[PDB]
UniProtKB/Swiss-Prot annotation, chain B:
Matches recorded under NCBIfam families: PRK00011.1
Lineage of the organism: Bacteria, Bacillati, Bacillota, Bacilli, Bacillales
GO MF assignments: glycine hydroxymethyltransferase activity; pyridoxal phosphate binding
Annotated metabolic or biological route of this protein: One-carbon metabolism; tetrahydrofolate interconversion; Amino-acid biosynthesis; glycine biosynthesis; glycine from L-serine: step 1/1
The protein's name: Serine hydroxymethyltransferase
Originating organism: Staphylococcus aureus (strain COL)
Annotated site residue numbers, Plays an important role in substrate specificity: 218
PROSITE patterns, A to Z: SHMT (PS00096)
Annotated localization: Cytoplasm
Gene: glyA
Family the entry assigns: Belongs to the SHMT family.
Assembly behavior: Homodimer.
Length: 402, 404
């Protein structure tokens, strides 16, 4: 931060405070994560200066960004086994838009788990039908998904996308999609790191198209990626450029390469096994104390707690109470939530980031204890001060970026 | 680079080679540039880890105290530079900025009237709207505003766009606004090429007249790669919701902090001095090339861009020219001149821009030498000794003006 402190003290101080915020709070923000120094060094490189419209081999001065882009693609194939990879999407939404633009005509029907946040492009230019989860199980009901598919005849079925805490069976989506002659897209943003580590089934075996963010469980820089069958390659590539993007962010793409190389290491699997163990420990500990967990558990890194049903606090109340003791999570609409969307019945907890900084089972059992202390005693200052001190013990035990 | 070198040698190596390629070559690629080490440090920061859906003070996930500071500073500095009523710094790229504007100003199928020089359509703007092009006059190779007006009256665009193309002359936004008002169209300016010049006061500011102004934050503005929308207050709600949740999700806050840094740099007095040199350098390059017998599209330049009619001057195609110059260490793009009779991937022209070389310190004397090198190589494209001479003269300039 040498040059930036000299040039722009006010931005440099804000950046340092953001580092200290990430360090002094236990963030349990869904699928979010901490990237490596290597990843940040790539994003911060001179590749930001490069103008590289087009694709490797067919862009010019692009000889070296051809190397970093092609290695991003190679590593992506090694991780996920996809026939064709595009590492140019600027974000998940850009990856998603390109797929929709290829798979659909405007006005066509799409069947997906929930409509993101209609303002969203997917709801505006297409007839988006949601399947959600069953009111009794709080999980996907494949019978229900199939009935909707037969009734609405979507041209595209989407699985994933939502921050869902249970396994998604892509074989059963493929069966349903084939029955109604729909293409299948999976947005694996939340679970891509689990997929990479073999701990969630891989949608590439079944999907026409797979989109993802490169950040989150995959622990890369913020950005997107599309994997698809070879038959869609030409349309997908031209849709990304010049369809909806221009030049790619080659510094970010190099950083994608770095992250993908990390994900191919044996210790990434160990990492993701710890992420999932930690989430199970957290859920179980909360359950042991009377907290109802949506769907009664988790199969992944996410834990959704019904705080309203368990202790009578709203999700908004739970969120603020936790933030005040140093735990950052988000209020969450539970399935068929009676509370308004601004208030909600739930909070959503995710283990990737705290696991990256070193948290293990004992640490997550203590996090469960802290959460329970704070939420069950939300008006008791001594209790809250205790919780805050216990959060402080954990952060000091596991400092960020050492 | 120590962490990447330790962990991922292949990538570290490629990045080091890229740095060396930037240093060893004289890059004259239209509006491209070299950002500061401060800008890179911001992009390379831990702000990449932060999920910050929404806008400052109105976020969907909490813990946004500090990214609210950086995003708010980027907005405030953008207003100080361009005088815009509303600014959105979240667009991931120029094309995301542009798409958001079109989604707000237009319904699918509506007519839009916009410049094109490069000439179903693959671009979103051409595929989902009825995009009518204006270009330049065949004889002047400049915008003919009576023709623009004629097209507007004939086609009744709901949106008229000015800028966007890599045009070498000043664009009169007053005349565009008069035409837009006549046909009851909104006016958008894509100032990506000229944003730095506008910030420096060297090109008139389209914010005075436009409903919407889009830009990249890189190029002449010399910032990180990304987008920005400036717009009248009356469109602020629709614009912000079209960017999020319309077509994007979380912003890239590390990049936005890097925007703030670039905008800070652009506010300094030395930025105007830099832009003055950019434009002087391009005049020198154009005039030196004319003295060497090259025809310049429109006869010269008002900005950082110099478009050369290589086919009409010496009988090489833009493709041959681009290749010959790359072999001697000069990077430029072939381009379609107006009413170009060569095929689209062959072309008659090359386009040169001065921002990047100016950033590394080139002055008038340096750019006169660039013209002579270009003339030597292009006029002797099959003469190994003269090409090696060109190559050596490039190496003298790159040694004189090392990067970073």
């Amino acid at each position: 931060m040498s040059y930036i402190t000299k040039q722009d003290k006010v931005i440099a101080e804000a950046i340092e405070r953001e580092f200290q915020r990430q360090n002094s709070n236990i963030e349990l923000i869904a699928s979010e994560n901490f990237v490596s120094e290597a990843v940040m060094e790539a994003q911060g490189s001179v590749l930001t200066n490069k103008y590289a419209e087009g694709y490797p081999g067919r862009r010019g001065g692009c000889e070296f960004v051809d190397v970093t882009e092609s290695i991003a693609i190679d590593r992506a194939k090694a991780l996920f086994g996809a026939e064709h990879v595009n590492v140019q999407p600027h974000s998940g939404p850009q990856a998603n838009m390109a797929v929709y633009l290829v798979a659909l005509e405007m006005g066509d029907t799409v069947l997906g788990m929930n409509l993101s946040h209609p303002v969203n492009f997917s709801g505006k230019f297409y007839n988006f039908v949601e399947y959600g989860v069953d009111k009794d199980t709080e999980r996907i009901n494949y019978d229900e998904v199939r009935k909707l598919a037969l009734e609405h005849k979507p041209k595209l079925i989407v699985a994933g996308a939502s921050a869902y805490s249970r396994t998604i069976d892509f074989k059963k989506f493929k069966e349903i999609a084939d029955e109604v002659n729909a293409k299948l897209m999976v947005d694996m943003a939340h679970i891509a790191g689990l997929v990479a580590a073999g701990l969630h089934p891989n949608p590439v075996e079944y999907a026409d198209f797979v989109t993802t963010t490169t950040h989150k469980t995959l622990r890369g820089p913020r950005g997107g990626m599309i994997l698809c069958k070879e038959e869609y390659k030409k349309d997908i590539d031209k849709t990304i450029f010049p369809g909806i993007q221009g030049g790619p962010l080659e510094h970010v793409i190099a950083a994608k390469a770095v992250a993908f190389g990390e994900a191919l290491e044996n210790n990434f699997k160990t990492y993701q096994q710890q992420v999932v163990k930690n989430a199970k420990v957290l859920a179980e500990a909360l359950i042991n104390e009377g907290f109802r967990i949506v769907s009664g558990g988790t199969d992944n890194h996410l834990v959704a707690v019904d705080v309203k049903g368990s202790i009578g606090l709203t999700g908004k109340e739970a969120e603020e109470t936790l933030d005040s003791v140093g735990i950052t999570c988000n209020k969450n609409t539970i399935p068929f939530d009676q509370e308004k969307p601004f208030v909600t019945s739930g909070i959503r907890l995710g283990t990737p980031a705290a696991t990256t900084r070193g948290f293990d089972e004992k640490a997550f059992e203590e996090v469960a204890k802290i959460i329970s202390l704070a939420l069950k005693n939300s008006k008791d200052e001594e209790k809250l001060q205790q919780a805050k001190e216990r959060v402080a013990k954990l952060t000091a035990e596991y400092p960020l970026y050492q």
